[PDB]
Amino acid sequence: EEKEILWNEAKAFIAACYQELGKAAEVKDRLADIKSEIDLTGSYVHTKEELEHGAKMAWRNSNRCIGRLFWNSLNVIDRRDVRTKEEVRDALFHHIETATNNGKIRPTITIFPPEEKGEKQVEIWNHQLIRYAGYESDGERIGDPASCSLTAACEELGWRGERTDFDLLPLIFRMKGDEQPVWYELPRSLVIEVPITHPDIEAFSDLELKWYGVPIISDMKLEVGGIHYNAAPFNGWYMGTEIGARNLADEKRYDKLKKVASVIGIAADYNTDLWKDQALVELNKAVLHSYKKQGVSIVDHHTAASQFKRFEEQAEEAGRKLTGDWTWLIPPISPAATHIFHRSYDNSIVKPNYFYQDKPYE
Amino acid sequence: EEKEILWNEAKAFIAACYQELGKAAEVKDRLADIKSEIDLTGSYVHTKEELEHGAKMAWRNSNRCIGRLFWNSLNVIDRRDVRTKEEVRDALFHHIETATNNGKIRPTITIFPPEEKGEKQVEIWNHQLIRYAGYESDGERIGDPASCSLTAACEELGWRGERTDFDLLPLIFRMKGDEQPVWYELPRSLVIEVPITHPDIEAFSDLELKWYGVPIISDMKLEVGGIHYNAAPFNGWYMGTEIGARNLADEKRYDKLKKVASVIGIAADYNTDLWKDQALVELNKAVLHSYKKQGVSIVDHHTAASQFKRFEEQAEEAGRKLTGDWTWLIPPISPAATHIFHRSYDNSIVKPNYFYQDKPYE
């Protein structure tokens, strides 16, 4: 049954992949090879070409992602050769370094060995490779609430956070055959952070806000032709709203809107004053300004939506159906100022793709 | 077949209606009466109690409406007795007067005779009872683009607009048995309008913006227990974003964001400056300020969302399933600042309800 799922997925992927690569004539023989390989081993191994194009197709098919125009320029690093925790750690360090690229962020994915019998070879615990710790105890809240459960798990492994609002979590992952994950502190020289200042309002720096440069999602599964790459961290650059409208603004995250209102000199007393809306706009302006000033890549939601429009056009020109999740594609600030708000999207799931998977802790 | 649809809908409605009204014991005899009445006449007539509660249930079931907390205080005016165009006109004038209530807006619905064989008795052409005309010809655009087709239809009936940006469309409706609709100019004394000024920025008045006080939707069908009330205009007060984030801001509406940016003294040159977002916030502040200053009811999106939360709670307490359309319930400005953004809603259709219907022109 599982083999059949594998073979059916493989047939669909190879046909589509080789079509797009102008290799349609090679489909027949390649499928035969794979079919034999499944029969004998219970699985099959992707060529480097298949793996690279598969990761790109998976991004192209990610319904919730506004950044998909650039799917074909994804930098794919094949690390299916890793066998040791030192190799995994060094690969993750390298990913951070090469993706960061001194601020000129390169969209990158590092692909580790795939699941075998649904058995993971490498199990990454981090949500993102760079993320802040969170703490809550007897009433006191410190750091990023979204990291509370992982932070607590880490402190079960012998790690201890300094309990600033911006402690960098260590890398945490488990190797097949080990009962507990290992953790490694991030070399600070690898991690770019951006202090948040405002172009016009000098007092904004009093909030002492910062965010990290590069979002590197490390807890999703890349599925390509029936092969499950549960460990395959990927990154892009931020859209400013992710930081200014959500990470720093959500009541269940850093919850900074009242403090923002104060430093920009407006009252936070009356709903009809739209002080939350004004604070959100200024915080989002500050985020974009700060990343730009520091030479770290970022995109604003207007430019991002314009690029997404081009992605829609390119899909139509290539004769590919477009899929999207409207509820995630609209930016959380001024959504109706984008073309996305005013059309609809088919939210069908197409593979290859990136999927959520169960967490190994909690 | 149609009778069966009618009888099935009637059974569902009467049972539910009488339950909610504590009249469950009367359901049996009432259903018998209706069943006979359908047999003989092909239809049935609602009691005043049924009609009133039906209109209220229909609002309660309107998935796209954030304002539903107040469903049970809807003022229902029964005008099933009208037979002449003079009576219709006067009823519509009266609706405007009593709903407006000198600025302290009363949510009101006026219900006209229902369709018989799918044959309308009264056919209202207006989208809203008070709405601005729109014009486009050899390149020149005047007024509200969304009203262009109705405006053109009106000018086929002997009416002529002054071609300001805010011409009030006349009431336009057709009686059963007449081939053409009639039109009547709105008495200006009945129509409250609000000039848009800003609490802090004196130059905002240079834009010479205004909007009308009361949104009165006049082109939707109220369906209650299988009876189709195609003519049943209803009103509430505005949520500020409808005016400031959409009517005045949409590129395909009044398209005022660039002019707003200019009068508030910011550049409209760079996406990363978030000038559209800032302009939207100031325009929305001005809308709320202006309606408040003039003593015309309005609600901001934060307060409206808070009321909607109470509506959700009240549904749960009453043991009623909640339905909603997330994509319409989120406000078009700072949606993630509302609780609505962070939950999901079942978009199932429950009757009684209000529905779109085909336009009689174009």
Ligand code: HEM
């Ligand atoms: C290059 C710059 C990129 C930008 C600006 C961008 C933008 C975004 C944004 C704003 C989200 C929504 C996240 C949230 O609200 O939680 C998102 C989701 C997503 N992006 Fe992208 N993205 C980029 C690159 C990539 C890359 C390189 C991949 C993978 C190869 C990717 C795959 C996804 C996926 C899978 C999601 C969905 C996450 C989820 O369901 O929680 N994106 N993207």
Ligand code: HEM
């Ligand atoms: C009392 C104040 C009210 C407020 C603030 C309010 C708010 C809103 C808003 C903002 C919308 C979205 C409109 C759009 O974006 O196009 C809406 C939709 C709707 N409202 Fe309400 N509403 C109110 C009263 C009412 C009343 C009295 C009824 C009927 C009895 C009603 C029925 C609806 C319906 C049917 C829609 C959907 C319109 C469509 O699908 O195009 N509302 N409401």
Ligand SMILES: Cc1cc(N)nc(-c2ccc(CNCCc3cccc(F)c3)cc2)c1
């Ligand atoms: C590659 C990339 C670029 C970019 N600019 N953003 C992202 C990105 C950001 C955040 C997320 C996380 N989305 C939410 C996951 C989630 C889902 C449900 C509950 C939760 F607490 C968290 C995924 C991708 C990814």
Ligand SMILES: Cc1cc(N)nc(-c2ccc(CNCCc3cccc(F)c3)cc2)c1
């Ligand atoms: C009662 C009430 C109160 C309030 N504050 N707003 C409304 C209201 C406002 C606008 C609308 C119109 N919604 C869009 C109709 C539509 C749908 C599709 C295309 C179009 F051009 C227009 C409906 C109800 C209704």
Ligand SMILES: C[C@H](O)[C@H](O)[C@H]1CNc2nc(N)[nH]c(=O)c2N1
């Ligand atoms: C295409 C999309 O459904 C459309 O733009 C909707 C989105 N959500 C909305 N929500 C409201 N309240 N009003 C609208 O006009 C719309 N437009």
Ligand SMILES: C[C@H](O)[C@H](O)[C@H]1CNc2nc(N)[nH]c(=O)c2N1
């Ligand atoms: C409940 C709802 O689905 C949830 O709040 C979603 C809405 N749309 C979103 N869109 C993005 N981009 N990111 C998010 O976290 C969410 N949250």
Ligand SMILES: [Cl-]
């Ligand atoms: Cl993030």
Ligand SMILES: [Cl-]
């Ligand atoms: Cl409107």
